[PDB]
Amino acid sequence: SLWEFYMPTDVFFGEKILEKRGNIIDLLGKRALVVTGKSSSKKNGSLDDLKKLLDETEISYEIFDEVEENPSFDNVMKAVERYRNDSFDFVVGLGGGSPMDFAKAVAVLLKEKDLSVEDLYDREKVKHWLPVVEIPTTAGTGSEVTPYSILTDPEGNKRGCTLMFPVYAFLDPRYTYSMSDELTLSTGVDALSHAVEGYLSRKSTPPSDALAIEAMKIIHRNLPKAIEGNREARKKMFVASCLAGMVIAQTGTTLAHALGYPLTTEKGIKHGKATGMVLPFVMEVMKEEIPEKVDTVNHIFGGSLLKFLKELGLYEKVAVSSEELEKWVEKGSRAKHLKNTPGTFTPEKIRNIYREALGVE
Amino acid sequence: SLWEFYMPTDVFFGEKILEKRGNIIDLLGKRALVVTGKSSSKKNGSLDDLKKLLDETEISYEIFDEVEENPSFDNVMKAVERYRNDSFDFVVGLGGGSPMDFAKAVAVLLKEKDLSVEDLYDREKVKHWLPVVEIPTTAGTGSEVTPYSILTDPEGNKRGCTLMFPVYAFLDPRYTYSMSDELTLSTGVDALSHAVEGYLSRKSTPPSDALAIEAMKIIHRNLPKAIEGNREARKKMFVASCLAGMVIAQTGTTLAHALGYPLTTEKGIKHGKATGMVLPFVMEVMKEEIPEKVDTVNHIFGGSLLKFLKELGLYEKVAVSSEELEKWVEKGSRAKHLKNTPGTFTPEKIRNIYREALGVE
């Protein structure tokens, strides 16, 4: 066999974590660029805490609070072209996966001033970048512990790239208490999918399996209560989302993530819910290769992950034309994730996965 | 509550791993110092593989193959003084815990020529150091993924310190197939203790708990067969020892490790066996603060860790005087590990832990 474990991010978790461990960012420089969403970070106390930390460490900064959900190439360039004229020592991503991923792309482009966003997809061109600090507020994408960035290209397709691991990750569960029940559900299922896909992936490793198993157990026991607003459960979900991120940082994701993309970009379905909807059906095909592991996942979730997700009210009614379905099937058949997904996926199997997922509601 | 996860070592695992991924050390420099034991690494093909790797990568080197079991301050200075006139870019530890720990100490001292071994216990003085590469051959201390180094001081006492994390760890399971049944047993129990102590420690964290649980399950299922010589079992033990190293790299150890030291330094009992002998009894006390987790550990090991260890033939007959016992009880009452160990340990309880462990056989 042959495997590798690499997750160099220094992770700090706890209430008031920026106050208690945040000063370490002073090792990164004297001026920082903060990238965050339009309003969430202003309402959960995170931006205020960050401003306090920057003031305390006497680090000057600028705030780009215009990151959109599922950020596009243009969104990133709208910030890069402007901040390339400044001189930042490091970048801080604050919020959900969108601003956290946005921060990684900007960190490279502010250093590599001659590169375009498309160039980021060429690993050979990514050799220099500003350090990145991530402060997540959802539970979650686990972006604070992965080297990935996902952007929507000019054609409207979600495309991911591998950049750098954040130097520091600061997780304060209090920031997640403001999530709506619906966002808690979607982000929680995204975390669930990361742990499940990482465990079932052909790139699975012993360390990532260990982390994935614990994450799955935590999510199974806490997601329902978290959605309802139970604080202790939300704290556990935040822990699980981080563990799951560590997992995919080793394994990457599977066809489940790839197939959910069009549901998000074309049907407005939140990322986590989109992935979660197709995941159980992708698993049915994976069974042809790893039935034991698939059985393990179903057992952890009470006997059936599909039923577990259905009980959460995850499935949505989605309008899909034959024309749209065929387009999604064609794109899925070319997903890079296919190589790391157990099972044999023909266009018909992918077509069936969508029909099954869409057929629930 | 508040926790941190940090384990930056880039870990590579697999048969012929040095041949397949070792070239990456080219990024560390052009000259290196190899520290290892007298014969071991020369008989399992590891030193041969390392020599070949260094030749292929065109990296000059010198070999210090005089690291003794449980190295002392003088041992380290012997190598340091012998090579302080030279100029190395990085250090490579090859072998078990002794040479790997030796490597970390030397890596600092060769950089900071004005420091003594005693200075290494002062975190403030350890500012710079040469990069370290670890290649373990036992399953194991997990030293390849921890920042710890343990040496025997002039007084003959085991004293550990925290230095740096190795940049790269290369694990080839084939190297462990040459271990004697006794060494497999002792190093295997050491790994078991790391996982168990890390899980039970007051410094336990979610990520380390995840890794510890998996490590414990692997060891329970494979240690007996590994001792018998089963290669699949030994390969699994090697994975577990690594996972366990990642665990203590976050948690540190408990009173069990502390109480076993005098058995090693004064009675020649191998580290793993010494810790393992007292572990079940230290756990009995822990049950006062964390009965849930202790029950979990016993459940994983077939219902009783004590019985599991006894069945391995772990316990040894040891000649101990009252004077010696009282000295150990006294020192045990002043171990830093006490603070991170659940339960209340009175001199009477510690004396009883030793009596119980020594009374088994």
Ligand SMILES: NC(=O)c1ccc[n+]([C@@H]2O[C@H](COP(=O)([O-])OP(=O)(O)OC[C@H]3O[C@@H](n4cnc5c(N)ncnc54)[C@H](OP(=O)(O)O)[C@@H]3O)[C@@H](O)[C@H]2O)c1
């Ligand atoms: N790096 C990776 O490996 C990885 C993994 C999984 C997913 N992703 C990517 O991450 C993105 C998904 O991010 P996400 O699900 O965390 O959400 P998101 O897209 O970052 O934002 C979701 C929405 O929730 C809001 N929000 C964020 N934190 C909140 C809080 N604490 N309380 C209330 N509302 C809050 C946001 O408000 P504001 O806009 O006002 O801030 C936003 O409107 C996708 O683009 C996905 O492809 C990346």
Ligand SMILES: NC(=O)c1ccc[n+]([C@@H]2O[C@H](COP(=O)([O-])OP(=O)(O)OC[C@H]3O[C@@H](n4cnc5c(N)ncnc54)[C@H](OP(=O)(O)O)[C@@H]3O)[C@@H](O)[C@H]2O)c1
């Ligand atoms: N850094 C940490 O966090 C950490 C954790 C646990 C323990 N430790 C420390 O590590 C030391 C324990 O090391 P250890 O149990 O791995 O053993 P060790 O002390 O490194 O050596 C044990 C003996 O086994 C031999 N050996 C090593 N690899 C072998 C192989 N593949 N086949 C056959 N024989 C082999 C050695 O031979 P040669 O002498 O010929 O090489 C040596 O004589 C202690 O000093 C302990 O305090 C450190």
Ligand SMILES: [Zn+2]
């Ligand atoms: Zn995701």
Ligand SMILES: [Zn+2]
């Ligand atoms: Zn040990």
